[PDB]
Amino acid sequence: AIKFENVSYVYSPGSPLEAIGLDQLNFSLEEGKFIALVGHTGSGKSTLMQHFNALLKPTSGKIEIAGYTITPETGNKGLKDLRRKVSLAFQFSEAQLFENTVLKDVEYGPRNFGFSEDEAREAALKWLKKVGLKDDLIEHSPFDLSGGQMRRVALAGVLAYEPEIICLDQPAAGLDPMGRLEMMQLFKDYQAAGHTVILVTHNMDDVADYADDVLALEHGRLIKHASPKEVFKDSEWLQKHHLAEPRSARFAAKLEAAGLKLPGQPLTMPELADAIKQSLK
Amino acid sequence: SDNIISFDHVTFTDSPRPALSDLSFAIERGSWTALIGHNGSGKSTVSKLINGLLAPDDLDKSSITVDGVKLGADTVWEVREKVGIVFQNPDNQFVGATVSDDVAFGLENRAVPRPEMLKIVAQAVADVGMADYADSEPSNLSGGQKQRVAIAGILAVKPQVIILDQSTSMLDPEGKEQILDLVRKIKEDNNLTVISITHDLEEAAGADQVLVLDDGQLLDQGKPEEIFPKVEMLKRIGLDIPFVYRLKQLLKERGIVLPDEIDDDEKLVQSLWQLNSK
Amino acid sequence: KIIIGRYLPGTTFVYRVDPRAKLLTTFYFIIMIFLANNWVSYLVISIFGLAYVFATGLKARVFWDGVKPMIWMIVFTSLLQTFFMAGGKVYWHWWIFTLSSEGLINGLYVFIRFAMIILVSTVMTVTTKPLEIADAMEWMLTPLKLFKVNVGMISLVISIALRFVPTLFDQTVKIMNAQRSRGADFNDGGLVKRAKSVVPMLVPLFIDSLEVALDLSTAMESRGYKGSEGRTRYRILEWSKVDLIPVAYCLLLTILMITTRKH
Numbered sequence: 121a122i123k124f125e126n127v128s129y130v131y132s133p134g135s136p137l138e139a140i141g142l143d144q145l146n147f148s149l150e151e152g153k154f155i156a157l158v159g160h161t162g163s164g165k166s167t168l169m170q171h172f173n174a175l176l177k178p179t180s181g182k183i184e185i186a187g188y189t190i191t192p193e194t195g196n197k198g199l200k201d202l203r204r205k206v207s208l209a210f211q212f213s214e215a216q217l218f219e220n221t222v223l224k225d226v227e228y229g230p231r232n233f234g235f236s237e238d239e240a241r242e243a244a245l246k247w248l249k250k251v252g253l254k255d256d257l258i259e260h261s262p263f264d265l266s267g268g269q270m271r272r273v274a275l276a277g278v279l280a281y282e283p284e285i286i287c288l289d290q291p292a293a294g295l296d297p298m299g300r301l302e303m304m305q306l307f308k309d310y311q312a313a314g315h316t317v318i319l320v321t322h323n324m325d326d327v328a329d330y331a332d333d334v335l336a337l338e339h340g341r342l343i344k345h346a347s348p349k350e351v352f353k354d355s356e357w358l359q360k361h362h363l364a365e366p367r368s369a370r371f372a373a374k375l376e377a378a379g380l381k382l383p384g385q386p387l388t389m390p391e392l393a394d395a396i397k398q399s400l401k
Numbered sequence: 402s403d404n405i406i407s408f409d410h411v412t413f414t415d416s417p418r419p420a421l422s423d424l425s426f427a428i429e430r431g432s433w434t435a436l437i438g439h440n441g442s443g444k445s446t447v448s449k450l451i452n453g454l455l456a457p458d459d460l461d462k463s464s465i466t467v468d469g470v471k472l473g474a475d476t477v478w479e480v481r482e483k484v485g486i487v488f489q490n491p492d493n494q495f496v497g498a499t500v501s502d503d504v505a506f507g508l509e510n511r512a513v514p515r516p517e518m519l520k521i522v523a524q525a526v527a528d529v530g531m532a533d534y535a536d537s538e539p540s541n542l543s544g545g546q547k548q549r550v551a552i553a554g555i556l557a558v559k560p561q562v563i564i565l566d567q568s569t570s571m572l573d574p575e576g577k578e579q580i581l582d583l584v585r586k587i588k589e590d591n592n593l594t595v596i597s598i599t600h601d602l603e604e605a606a607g608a609d610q611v612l613v614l615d616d617g618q619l620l621d622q623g624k625p626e627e628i629f630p631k632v633e634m635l636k637r638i639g640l641d642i643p644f645v646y647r648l649k650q651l652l653k654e655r656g657i658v659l660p661d662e663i664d665d666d667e668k669l670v671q672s673l674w675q676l677n678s679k
Numbered sequence: 680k681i682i683i684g685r686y687l688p689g690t691t692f693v694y695r696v697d698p699r700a701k702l703l704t705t706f707y708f709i710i711m712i713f714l715a716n717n718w719v720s721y722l723v724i725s726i727f728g729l730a731y732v733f734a735t736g737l738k739a740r741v742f743w744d745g746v747k748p749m750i751w752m753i754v755f756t757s758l759l760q761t762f763f764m765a766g767g768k769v770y771w772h773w774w775i776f777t778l779s780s781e782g783l784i785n786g787l788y789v790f791i792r793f794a795m796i797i798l799v800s801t802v803m804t805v806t807t808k809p810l811e812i813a814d815a816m817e818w819m820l821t822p823l824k825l826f827k828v829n830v831g832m833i834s835l836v837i838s839i840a841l842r843f844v845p846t847l848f849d850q851t852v853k854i855m856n857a858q859r860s861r862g863a864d865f866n867d868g869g870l871v872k873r874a875k876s877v878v879p880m881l882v883p884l885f886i887d888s889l890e891v892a893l894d895l896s897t898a899m900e901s902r903g904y905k906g907s908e909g910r911t912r913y914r915i916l917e918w919s920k921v922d923l924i925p926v927a928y929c930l931l932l933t934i935l936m937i938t939t940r941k942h
């Protein structure tokens with residue numbers, strides 16, 4: 121499991137512009153689950169993601185992940201196996217791509233983790249085809265691409281070497297609808313293969329569709345740690361804490377307001393359709 | 402027609418294929434146009450061409466006219482005062498050393514007096530909900546905060562054409578709704594035109610016009626209730642349909658038949674209520 | 680984190696000094712640095728530079744951590760000059776290299792000179808916004824407006840060059856994090872192995888820094904920046920009473936060295 125006890129992070133602690141990125145986090149994410157990290161902008165989701173793979177060390181508290189104990193005094197030495205096990209896709213793909221070509225960039229990861237040249241090339245090609253990138257783009261520069269294409273390159277590079285924990289900082293931003301759905305299904309199928317997926321997202325429909333557990337942030341404080349159903353039970357709590365509700369739940373509320381009550385609380389589109397048909401039956 | 406692109410070719414840099422090929426469209430004055438398309442169709446290329454940051458491959462056969470002036474070498478600055486563009490990457494928008502400085506840069510370039518600049522920058526920073534970060538380095542911000550600052554820097558000058566290159570991609574739903582309402586209110590108050598390059602089809606469904614771009618070519622162009630009914634065309638090119646049309650198709654495949662004239666949530670709700678009433 | 684060329688927000692008096700007065704004081708101090716011939720004149724310039732640094736208000740540890748690598752580079756250069764040039768008494772004369780009293784004296788002097796050039800440049804860039812530095816540079820080059828010289832372009836290029844170093848270190852951090860996330864180990868093996876791990880980064884760092892520097896000008900142009908002529912100012916640019924603080928600092932210093940130089 122991924123355990124955080126009393127984890128706080130402060131940006132520039134000694135400066136007069138001191139800002140508390142995270143404030144006393146305490147949670148335990150289960151292995152093999154789909155976790156959705158939600159919250160308002162600037163609530164500390166990217167700081168949490170960078171804490172998962174020890175890119176940032178906590179100002180206080182302890183992190184236990186993948187057989188590793190990260191403390192405020194850990195250091196960058198001996199952290200290659202942790203990042204072998206845990207991979208992070210950044211919010212901005214520009215801060216992630218550095219190699220000359222797309223193929224070289226994607227297979228950079230496998231090369232560092234004991235993949236031979238043939239194995240690295242096969243994995244890179246397979247995961248470039250999986251992310252829906254054209255075959256002729258593998259020899260172009262990662263920076264001579266569109267934003268969504270850069271996002272796809274970053275995702276393929278992250279998923280190339282099969283980490284057991286995939287942290288994704290808004291991987292669906294910049295992706296077209298078909299590409300967005302394909303990436304969501306790809307992550308769900310990856311999780312179904314025996315992997316843990318942690319997902320920063322601003323789309324509550326993704327939370328209702330794919331997430332098994334939900335982790336809600338507000339100003340660096342963990343305000344809720346529950347399943348999507350329990351998170352989206354109450355709309356007053358959601359609105360009070362800068363959070364929203366899935367469009368299916370909003371449409372169900374609209375339908376109930378007009379006079380058509382629906383059984384339970386739909387959160388996904390097929391569930392809402394089934395509830396509507398049951399009500400009309 | 403506020404913007405007129407006519408027979409536009411652009412090859413980047415060298416590149417083997419053109420990003421845009423014989424592209425021609427018009428943007429109605431004082432409207433909301435949603436430019437949609439798969440990843441790799443030249444939407445950001447179109448945005449940078451309208452500004453003047455990029456030039457067409459052939460100059461004496463391609464035309465770009467922005468509010469009556471033909472965009473060119475000698476009229477680029479006459480156009481940049483009409484077009485304000487929020488870039489796809491917020492890091493490429495920031496110039497000033499703080500949030501207020503960055504928002505006030507574009508007002509400085511327009512020779513706005515400082516007493517008015519103070520009020521305008523304060524109002525713009527508060528409007529995007531970043532009043533507590535006015536003295537912060539824009540690079541020391543989250544992605545959504547950087548997007549808010551980038552939007553505020555452009556909405557402060559209120560240009561005749563606001564181009565938004567996926568400016569709500571990293572915003573929370575409350576922030577998305579707030580900033581979309583702010584842009585709509587500013588557009589209505591100042592009689593402006595908005596081109597919203599977006600991958601969110603809910604926003605595109607609420608636009609006045611929808612431009613559909615495929616491999617750098619205008620595949621389709623029309624109102625949202627004339628575009629989104631074409632499910633096969635949109636799915637074939639990497640797009641989709643908004644929430645209401647998907648719900649209608651699931652209801653149809655579940656046995657509930659609904660009229661095709663339904664295009665909004667309220668219409669669907671009323672139709673379902675009438676169906677339940679019988 | 681490196682602080683040279685990078686603006687650090689603050690509230691002390693040096694932040695309210697005019698950027699033009701600050702730039703004039705920095706250039707005047709750099710001019711005075713080359714006028715130090717005696718040990719006591721170098722000492723006087725030393726206290727004056729240290730007082731200038733203390734006026735910034737940053738903690739001494741923060742300033743040292745921001746200027747450490749380039750201080751070490753200056754130390755290496757001073758040691759190289761000490762070894763290459765010799766005179767007077769000889770201490771060791773080990774192999775082709777040698778150690779001399781005159782060589783040690785000149786090495787110390789070069790270290791002090793380059794160090795305090797770095798300190799005054801860092802104090803100027805930390806306490807002044809980059810566009811404020813560009814505006815002050817363009818104001819200073821106003822006479823150079825004769826002979827039809829584009830002073831605004833030169834000032835913008837100077838500001839870009841000043842921002843180049845912070846972009847260098849920011850890109851260094853960015854690619855280091857990007858490579859760490861995907862399995863690079865810059866903290867393994869000896870110096871040879873670490874140099875091997877960091878050597879493929881050099882070309883990406885400089886290319887990315889140049890790209891960012893040009894993207895800054897692209898962002899300026901996209902938002903209507905024809906030039907520095909005809910614009911207004913969000914921040915007031917006027918002389919004030921605090922502007923007399925540098926002048927006395929520029930005056931007293933001079934007096935001292937005029938009575939302190941070798942001549």
Ligand SMILES: Nc1ncnc2c1ncn2[C@@H]1O[C@H](COP(=O)(O)OP(=O)(O)OP(=O)(O)O)[C@@H](O)[C@H]1O
Pocket residue numbers: 131132139140141159160161162163164165166167168211540541542543544545546571573
């Ligand atoms: N480098 C930094 N220096 C200082 N403060 C920072 C830095 N990066 C982020 N912050 C601040 O820390 C807080 C959390 O930022 P963070 O990046 O974790 O947010 P987030 O949840 O990822 O937001 P978004 O949804 O906009 O991406 C915000 O108040 C932000 O302004």
Ligand SMILES: Nc1ncnc2c1ncn2[C@@H]1O[C@H](COP(=O)(O)OP(=O)(O)OP(=O)(O)O)[C@@H](O)[C@H]1O
Pocket residue numbers: 263264265266267268269294413414416420438439440441442443444445446447489
């Ligand atoms: N800097 C560049 N150099 C070369 N080719 C580029 C560059 N930027 C984009 N391209 C290419 O030009 C075409 C148009 O891409 P563009 O960025 O205009 O699309 P987009 O719709 O804005 O992108 P996205 O939806 O993926 O964010 C694509 O084939 C892309 O790979």
Ligand SMILES: [Mg+2]
Pocket residue numbers: 165166211289543544545
């Ligand atoms: Mg973030």
Ligand SMILES: [Mg+2]
Pocket residue numbers: 266267268444445446489
């Ligand atoms: Mg784009």
